[PDB]
Amino acid sequence: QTHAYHMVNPSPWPLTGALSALLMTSGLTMWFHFNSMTLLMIGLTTNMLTMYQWWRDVIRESTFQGHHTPAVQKGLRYGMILFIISEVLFFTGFFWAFYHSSLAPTPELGGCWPPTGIHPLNPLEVPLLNTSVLLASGVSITWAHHSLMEGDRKHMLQALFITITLGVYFTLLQASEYYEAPFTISDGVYGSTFFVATGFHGLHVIIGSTFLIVCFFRQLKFHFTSNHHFGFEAAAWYWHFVDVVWLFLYVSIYWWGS
Amino acid sequence: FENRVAEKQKLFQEDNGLPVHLKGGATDNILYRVTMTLCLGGTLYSLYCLGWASFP
Amino acid sequence: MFINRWLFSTNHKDIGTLYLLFGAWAGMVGTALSLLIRAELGQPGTLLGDDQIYNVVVTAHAFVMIFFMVMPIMIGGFGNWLVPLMIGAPDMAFPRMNNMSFWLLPPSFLLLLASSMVEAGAGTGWTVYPPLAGNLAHAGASVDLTIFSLHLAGVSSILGAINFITTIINMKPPAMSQYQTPLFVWSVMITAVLLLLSLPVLAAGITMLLTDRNLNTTFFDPAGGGDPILYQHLFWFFGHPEVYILILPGFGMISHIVTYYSGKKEPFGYMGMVWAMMSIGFLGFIVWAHHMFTVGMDVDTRAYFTSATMIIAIPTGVKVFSWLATLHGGNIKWSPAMMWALGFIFLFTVGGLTGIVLANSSLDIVLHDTYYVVAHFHYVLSMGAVFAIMGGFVHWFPLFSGYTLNDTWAKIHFAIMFVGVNMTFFPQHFLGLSGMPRRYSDYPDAYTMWNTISSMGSFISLTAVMLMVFIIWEAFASKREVLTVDLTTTNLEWLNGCPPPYHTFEEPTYVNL
Amino acid sequence: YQTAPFDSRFPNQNQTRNCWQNYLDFHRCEKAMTAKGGDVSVCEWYRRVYKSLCPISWVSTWDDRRAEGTFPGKI
Amino acid sequence: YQTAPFDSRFPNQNQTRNCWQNYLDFHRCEKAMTAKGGDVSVCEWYRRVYKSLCPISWVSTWDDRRAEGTFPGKI
Amino acid sequence: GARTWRFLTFGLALPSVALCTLNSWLHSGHRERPAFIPYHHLRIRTKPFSWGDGNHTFFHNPRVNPLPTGYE
Amino acid sequence: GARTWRFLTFGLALPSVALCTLNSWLHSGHRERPAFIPYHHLRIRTKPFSWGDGNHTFFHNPRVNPLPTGYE
Amino acid sequence: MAYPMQLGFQDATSPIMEELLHFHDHTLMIVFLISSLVLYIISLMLTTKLTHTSTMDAQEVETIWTILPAIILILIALPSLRILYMMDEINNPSLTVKTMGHQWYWSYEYTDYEDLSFDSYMIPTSELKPGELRLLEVDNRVVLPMEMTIRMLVSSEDVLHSWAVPSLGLKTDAIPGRLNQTTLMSSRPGLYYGQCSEICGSNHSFMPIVLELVPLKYFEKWSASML
Amino acid sequence: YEEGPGKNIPFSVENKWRLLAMMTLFFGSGFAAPFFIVRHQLLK
Numbered sequence A: 001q002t003h004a005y006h007m008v009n010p011s012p013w014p015l016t017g018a019l020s021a022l023l024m025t026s027g028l029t030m031w032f033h034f035n036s037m038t039l040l041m042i043g044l045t046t047n048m049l050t051m052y053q054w055w056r057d058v059i060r061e062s063t064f065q066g067h068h069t070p071a072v073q074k075g076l077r078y079g080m081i082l083f084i085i086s087e088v089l090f091f092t093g094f095f096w097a098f099y100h101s102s103l104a105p106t107p108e109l110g111g112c113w114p115p116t117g118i119h120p121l122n123p124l125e126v127p128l129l130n131t132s133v134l135l136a137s138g139v140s141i142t143w144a145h146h147s148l149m150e151g152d153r154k155h156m157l158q159a160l161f162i163t164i165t166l167g168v169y170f171t172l173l174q175a176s177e178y179y180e181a182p183f184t185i186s187d188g189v190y191g192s193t194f195f196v197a198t199g200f201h202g203l204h205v206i207i208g209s210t211f212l213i214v215c216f217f218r219q220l221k222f223h224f225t226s227n228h229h230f231g232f233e234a235a236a237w238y239w240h241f242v243d244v245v246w247l248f249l250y251v252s253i254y255w256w257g258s
Numbered sequence B: 001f002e003n004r005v006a007e008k009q010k011l012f013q014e015d016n017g018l019p020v021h022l023k024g025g026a027t028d029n030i031l032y033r034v035t036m037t038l039c040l041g042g043t044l045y046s047l048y049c050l051g052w053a054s055f056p
Numbered sequence C: 001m002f003i004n005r006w007l008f009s010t011n012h013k014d015i016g017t018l019y020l021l022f023g024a025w026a027g028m029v030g031t032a033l034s035l036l037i038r039a040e041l042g043q044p045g046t047l048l049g050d051d052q053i054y055n056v057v058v059t060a061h062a063f064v065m066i067f068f069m070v071m072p073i074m075i076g077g078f079g080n081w082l083v084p085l086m087i088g089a090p091d092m093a094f095p096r097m098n099n100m101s102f103w104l105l106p107p108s109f110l111l112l113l114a115s116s117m118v119e120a121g122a123g124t125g126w127t128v129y130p131p132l133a134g135n136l137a138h139a140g141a142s143v144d145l146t147i148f149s150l151h152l153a154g155v156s157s158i159l160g161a162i163n164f165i166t167t168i169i170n171m172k173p174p175a176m177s178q179y180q181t182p183l184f185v186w187s188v189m190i191t192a193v194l195l196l197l198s199l200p201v202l203a204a205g206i207t208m209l210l211t212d213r214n215l216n217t218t219f220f221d222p223a224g225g226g227d228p229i230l231y232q233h234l235f236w237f238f239g240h241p242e243v244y245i246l247i248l249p250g251f252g253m254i255s256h257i258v259t260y261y262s263g264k265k266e267p268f269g270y271m272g273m274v275w276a277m278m279s280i281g282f283l284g285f286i287v288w289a290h291h292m293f294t295v296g297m298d299v300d301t302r303a304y305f306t307s308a309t310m311i312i313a314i315p316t317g318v319k320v321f322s323w324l325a326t327l328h329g330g331n332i333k334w335s336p337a338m339m340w341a342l343g344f345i346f347l348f349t350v351g352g353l354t355g356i357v358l359a360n361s362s363l364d365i366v367l368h369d370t371y372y373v374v375a376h377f378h379y380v381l382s383m384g385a386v387f388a389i390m391g392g393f394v395h396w397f398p399l400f401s402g403y404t405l406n407d408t409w410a411k412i413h414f415a416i417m418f419v420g421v422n423m424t425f426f427p428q429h430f431l432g433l434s435g436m437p438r439r440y441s442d443y444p445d446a447y448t449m450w451n452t453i454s455s456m457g458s459f460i461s462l463t464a465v466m467l468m469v470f471i472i473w474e475a476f477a478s479k480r481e482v483l484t485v486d487l488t489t490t491n492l493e494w495l496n497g498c499p500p501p502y503h504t505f506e507e508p509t510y511v512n513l
Numbered sequence D, E: 001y002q003t004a005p006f007d008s009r010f011p012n013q014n015q016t017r018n019c020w021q022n023y024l025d026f027h028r029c030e031k032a033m034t035a036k037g038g039d040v041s042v043c044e045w046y047r048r049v050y051k052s053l054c055p056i057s058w059v060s061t062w063d064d065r066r067a068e069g070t071f072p073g074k075i
Numbered sequence F, G: 001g002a003r004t005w006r007f008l009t010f011g012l013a014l015p016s017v018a019l020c021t022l023n024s025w026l027h028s029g030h031r032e033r034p035a036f037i038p039y040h041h042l043r044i045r046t047k048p049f050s051w052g053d054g055n056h057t058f059f060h061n062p063r064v065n066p067l068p069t070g071y072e
Numbered sequence H: 001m002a003y004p005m006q007l008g009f010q011d012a013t014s015p016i017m018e019e020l021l022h023f024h025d026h027t028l029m030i031v032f033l034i035s036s037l038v039l040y041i042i043s044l045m046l047t048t049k050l051t052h053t054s055t056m057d058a059q060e061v062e063t064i065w066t067i068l069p070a071i072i073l074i075l076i077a078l079p080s081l082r083i084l085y086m087m088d089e090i091n092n093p094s095l096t097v098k099t100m101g102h103q104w105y106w107s108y109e110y111t112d113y114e115d116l117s118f119d120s121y122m123i124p125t126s127e128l129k130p131g132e133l134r135l136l137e138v139d140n141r142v143v144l145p146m147e148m149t150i151r152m153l154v155s156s157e158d159v160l161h162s163w164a165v166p167s168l169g170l171k172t173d174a175i176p177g178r179l180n181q182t183t184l185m186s187s188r189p190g191l192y193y194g195q196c197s198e199i200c201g202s203n204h205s206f207m208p209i210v211l212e213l214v215p216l217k218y219f220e221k222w223s224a225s226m227l
Numbered sequence I: 001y002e003e004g005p006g007k008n009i010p011f012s013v014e015n016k017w018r019l020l021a022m023m024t025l026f027f028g029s030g031f032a033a034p035f036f037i038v039r040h041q042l043l044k
Ligand code: HEA
Pocket: C020, C023, C024, C027, C028, C031, C034, C035, C037, C038, C058, C059, C061, C062, C065, C066, C069, C070, C073, C124, C125, C126, C127, C374, C378, C381, C382, C383, C385, C386, C389, C390, C393, C421, C424, C437, C438, C439, C440, C441, C454, C458, C461, C462, C465
C-alpha cells in the first residue's frame, strides 16, 4: 500500500458479536416468558468475550503493530464523536418521555407532578452529592489528560485513579439511593421515567468507569505516548458525556421534577 | 513496573502469517475456541428453544 | 479460506455482496407476504379464516421490505460496493465493524420469523402502537421478539452510519473537497446522518414498550399516567426520517444512471442536487406529526405540520427538474437501467404528489387509515425504492460480477414490472377516496372490483420477480466477460475493471490542487 | 340546559381535563355544601356538565375510588 | 374560632398569598351562593381567615377595585 | 497546564465533594414511612416480574416499598 | 470554508428569513383593541414623562395604547 | 356508503365534507397537471437527435423551479388552512354524544339529561335481513337529529380504535384515557356508514358505525321511548 | 483469495445446472417461507 489506512486482518469477532446479540435478545425473551436465564447468561458471556478480544486486537494493531497513522486516528475521532451523538439522541427519547408525562399530568396521577402518593428524593441530599462527584471527576480527568500530554506518568495515574474512584462512588451512592427509594419502577410513569432514565445513565457510568479502568491498566503498561493516546481521549469524551447527561437528569427529573 | 512495549511490538510483528487475533500464541486459540463454541452452541440452543416455543 | 473470506470479511466488496444476497432473499420473503395479502383481498369473504394471521402477514411484509430488503440493498450493498470505489478509498474506515453491521441482520431476521412462529404472531402493524402491542392485547413473546429484531437492525444501521460518515469525511483524496464527491456518495452521507439521529429515538421508544410489557412501567399506559400518543411521537420522530432514508440512496443512484445513459459527464446542477438532498434531510425531522392528524392534536399544530410538510416539495422538485435537465440534450442510450430510472422519475412524482394531498390535515381526516395512504407510499416508496434498486442492479451488475446481462430480457422484465405495479396500486386511490380502510382482512361488497383488479396486478409483478431470477441465472450461466465500458472518465467505480480486484486503490489516485 | 357549552379553558380536541375539572368542581362543591349542611342545588351546573361530557366508566371508577379512599385528586 | 390556623399551603414567613387566597375564596363562594340565592353563611371560614390575616388597607383597596371593575383576580 | 488542573482537583473539586458528603451524612437518618394507600396508579402489576414470587420489585426494600396489598 | 458558509447563508439562513417573513406577512393586519379597564397595575404614572404633555409614553400609539383615563 | 366502481369520495352529507370535495377537486387538478407535465417533459427530452452535452448553467432555471412550486404550494395551503380553521370555529352544539371503542364493537352514551347507553355490534353475514349490507349493519344505530350541531366525544375502554364516517368528513381516534371531540352536522336524514379506522386486532374489519339521522321531533320521541 | 469473474462470490458458477439448483433452493426457500409460516399458524 502507499496510503496511510488500515487493512484489518480477517476477524471472527463481528460474527461472535452478532451471535452474542442473538443470544442476549433470545435470552431476554426466554427470561421474560419461559422462566429461564440460560441463553441470557451464554449471551452475556459471549458478548464480554467478544468485546475483550476485539478491543485487545485494536491495542495489538495500534500500540504493538503501528497501524494507527494520523489518518487512522482522525477516523477513530470522528467515529467516537458520532457514537456519542447517537447516545445523546437515545437519551433525548427518555427526556421526551419525562417532559411529556410531567408537563401534562393525567387525572390518574391526580392531575399533578409529582403524582399523588409519590414522595420524591430530596435533590439537596445524595443527588447533590452525586452531582459534586461527577463534576469533580470531570476536573480530575482533565488533570490526567494534561499530565499525560506533559509526560508525567505518576500524576496521570493518580488523577485517573481519582477519576475512577469518583465513578465508583457515584455508582455505590446510586445503588444505595435505589434501595432506599420509597417508590419503584412500578410506581406509574413517575417511577418509570425515574428508573429507566437514571438506570440507563448508571449503565453508562459503569461502562465509562470500565473504559477508564482499561485506560489505567494500559497506562500502567506504558501503552500511551505523550502525543498518541486516543483510547484515553475517547474515554475522557465518553466520561464528559456521562457527566453532562447527569446534569440534565439532575435539573430535569430530580430538581424541576420534584 | 517497566516499559515492555518493545518486546510486545517484536511478538506482534513476527513474520509468522498469523492473523492479529491469534498472534499472541496458544492462549488466543483457546479463548477463540471457547468463544466460538459458546456462540455456535448457544445459537443451536436458541433454534431448539424456537422449535419448542413454536407449538403449545 | 471460505470461512475466512465470507464469515470473517474485512473487505467492502465482499460485505457489499453479502448485503445484496441478503436483501435479494429478504425481497422474496417480502414479496411472498405481499401476495398473501393480495390473495386475501382478491375476493370478498375470508380466505385465511384467521384475521389475526392476516394482520401478522401485513406487519411482517412491511418489516421485511423496509429493514431486510431496501436498507440492506441500498446502504449495505450499493453503499459498501460503490462508496469506497467512487472516492478512491482502499476500504471503509472500520472494515471489521462493517462486517458486524452485516452479521447482525440474519439474527435480526431470525427474531422476526420467531415472532411469527410463536403464539399468534405480532398482528400490530409495523407501527407496533400500544395498547394493541402491549401485554394484554398481545400477551406472549411475539411483540418482544419483534422489538428485539428492531434493536438488532437498529444497531446494525447505527454502526453502519458511523462507518459511512467517517469514510466519506475522512477517506477522500486530499485534493477532493466534499463538493467534488459524486452525488451517490452525498446521498449515502445524508442517509447515514438521518440514521444516526433517528434510530436512537426509535430504540428509546421500543425499549419503553418492552419495559411496559415486562417490567411494569407505564410510559404508554394511562392507568400509570402514561399516554399511548407519546409512543406515536417517538415512533414517527424516527419514522418520517426513515421514509427519506429509504429513498435518498435511490435519488443518488438515479442521478448516476440518468447522467450515464444521457451520455453526460455530469448531472445538471450538482450543487442544487446537494442542496436539495440536505434540505430534504433537514425538513425530514420537523414534519413527523402528519402521521397523527386524527389523534386529537391542537389546530395550530395541525396548521404547522401541514405547512412544513408541503415545503419538502420545493427541494424535491429541484431534483426532479434536474434529472429532466440531465436528459436534455443527451445522446440517450435506451438501456434497461435507463428504463428503470425513467419509470422512477414518473412513479416517484405521482407518489410525491399524493403525499402533498395527504399533507393537508383537513383532507387527511378523510384519507388517513385508508387505501389512499397505501397507494401513496407504494408509488413513492415501493415503486421508487424498487425501481431505483432495479436500475442500480442492472447498471452495476457487470461491475460487481464481471458478466453482462441479456439486455432484451432485462427490458422484458422492466415492461412486466411496470404493468404489474400500476395495475396493483393505481386502483387503491379509488378504494381510499371511497373510504376503504387499510389493515382490513375483508371489505364491504362495494369495494370488490378495485380489490379484484389490484390482486390481479400483484400476480403480474410475481411473474416479473420470477423472470428476474432467471435473467440473473442466464448471465452467470453464459459467462459473457466485460471488455470495455464507456464514460470511465466520470465513473471512477468502473476504472479498476469488472469485477475490480479484492484490494483496489492500494496505490491511491493522484489528484493535484 | 341542553348540553355543556363551549368553555374557553378547554378549547381543543382533547376534552379530558374539561370532564375531570367539572367532576372535581361538583364533588368539591357537594362536600362544601354538606360540611355546613348547606344545599347541593348550588352544585347543579358542575353536575350537568360532567354528566354530559364524562364517560360513564370514568365517573363510575372515580366514584368507586372516592369510596375506597384511593381517588388521587383533592376534594 | 380564635385565629387563622397554620396552613401547610403557606408555611413560610411571607403570608401575602394566604391573605389573598382567603379573600378570593370568600368572594368566589359569596358569588356562587348569592347567584343561586343560597346561604353566604357557608363562606364564613374564608371570611374569618382573610379578616384575621389581611391588612385593613388591602381589603379596603380590593373591595374598592371589585366595585370599580378593576380587581385583577378572578371571582 | 497539569499543575492548574491538579490545583482545581484538590483546591475546589474534592473540597466540594467533602462538603456535599458532610451535608448528605447530616441528613442520612430514616424518614417515617407514609401511611399505605392502595392508589391504582402505583404498585402497577400488568405482568409478574421474572424473579422471586413475581410481585417484588428488583431492589425491593421492605421498610419503604409496600406491595399492592400493603407493607410486608 | 467560505464556500460552505455561503452555501449555508443562501441555502438555509436566507430561505428561513424568507419563510418567516411570509408567516409574519400573512398574520399581520390589526386585531381589534380590547375594552379599556382602568387597572391600577397598568398605565403607571408616579412622575410625568420628560416629553410631550408628561402623560404619553415614548412610542405612544393612539390606536392601541390607552391613557390612564382611556383611549384618546 | 360507497357503491360499486366508485372513483371518488362518497357524496357530502355535511357542509365541511362539501368544502373538502371542492378542495380535493382544486388539489387534484394541480396533481394531474404536474404529473402530466413531468411525463410530457420526459417524452420531449427523449424524442430528439439534437444534442448539447457540454456543461449547462443551472442558476437561471433554478429560480423558476423554486418560485413556481412555492406559489403552487401557497395556492393549496390557503384554502387548506381556511377549511382547517372552519372545522375548529366555536359552535354551540345542542347535543353531546359519547362513543367508546371496544374489541370489537362501539358503545354510545347520551347523558345530557338521562343515563341512556347501548352497545352497537356488527350484524353477522349469516343474520343479515334481505337487502342489508355485508360488514356494515349494526343492531343499534346511532340515532341523531338532522340539521343540528352535535358534539361527539370519542374514547376507548381497551386498545386504540378510530371512529369514522366518510360522508360526514369525520375520523377521530379513540384513545383510552383521552376524550377527543369532533362536531357532526348532517344536512340530510338517512343512514350514514363508517368503519373502525385504527388497527385494533383480529376484528378491526368488523366493528362499523351506522348513524340514523331523523328530524328533531323523531329524535325526541326516540329519546323519550328509551326511558 | 481467487480474483475475477465467478471467483468473487460465495457460490460456484463452474456448472450452470448446479448453479440453477443452488439459485432455486436460495430464492425458492425465501419465497416459500411465508406460505409455510401461515400453514403453521393455521394448523394451531
Ligand atoms: C419498501 C417497502 C415496500 C415494498 C417494496 C412493498 C411491496 C408490496 N406491497 Fe406493501 N407495504 C409496505 C411496504 C412495501 N410494500 C408497508 C410499510 C406497509 C404497511 C404495513 C402496515 O400497515 O403496518 C405495506 C402494506 C401493503 C398493503 C396494505 C395491507 C393492508 O393495509 O391490509 C398491500 C395491499 O395490497 C401491500 C402490497 C404490496 C405488494 C403487492 C408489493 C409488491 O408485490 C409490489 C412489487 C415489488 C416487488 C415484487 C419487490 C421486488 C424486489 C426484490 C425481489 C428485490 C430484488 C433484489 C435485488 C435485485 C438485489 N403492501
